[PDB]
Amino acid sequence: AVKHLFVLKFKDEITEAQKEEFFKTYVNLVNIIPAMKDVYWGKDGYTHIVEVTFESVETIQDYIIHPAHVGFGDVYRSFWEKLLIFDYTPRK
Template identity: 30%
Template sequence: MKIKVLLLLISMSLVSNAFAKTDENMTTTTMIQSDSLLRHTVFFKFKEGTTPAQIKKVEDAFSALPSKIEQIKGYEWGLNNSPEGLDKGFTHAFFLTFKSEEDRAIYLPHPDHKAFGAVLSPYLDDVFVIDYWTKQ
């Protein structure tokens, strides 16, 4: 009988340890979160008749934002070249990187971002935006 009680206590201890949050588990979770990056992806479809010079003006204005808004930690952009024909008229892809949702919250209403919107809006037919936390 003593052996059964002892085995029961050992089993309960093992089960409770399996579900306990340790410093090691907490560090791993924190590390993954701090290693993740917040990506803000933006895709543009321009109005029919928008000239190459007008599109260049938009490209240049967007590309100037990282030098004006310190919360942008990474920036890249490019033109669609997919052979699949599924772009639905979207030609431009922009990827901005932020370290936190707080940084993105500063960027979105930032006066320089708003000024960029004023440059873009006369030529914009449609926009598609997705934000996501990177995963390993």
């Protein structure tokens, strides 16, 4: 099982309630995007972390071009100053 992990910094103008709303609405994408298996997010100049579980590297791409994900980006991309993305298979 693979992970889609991303790390974010919000723009200064974004309020605390807005950041909270951002993650709540993101997590709700589990209700719309079949590829998303689980999501967790957290707050520790990056401040926030999001981890999504996927069946495979293939299913990650299904999430990427899903119309709800594209829609989320269009509404919310303006919230972040900068973002890093990582896709990988956890191993020990």
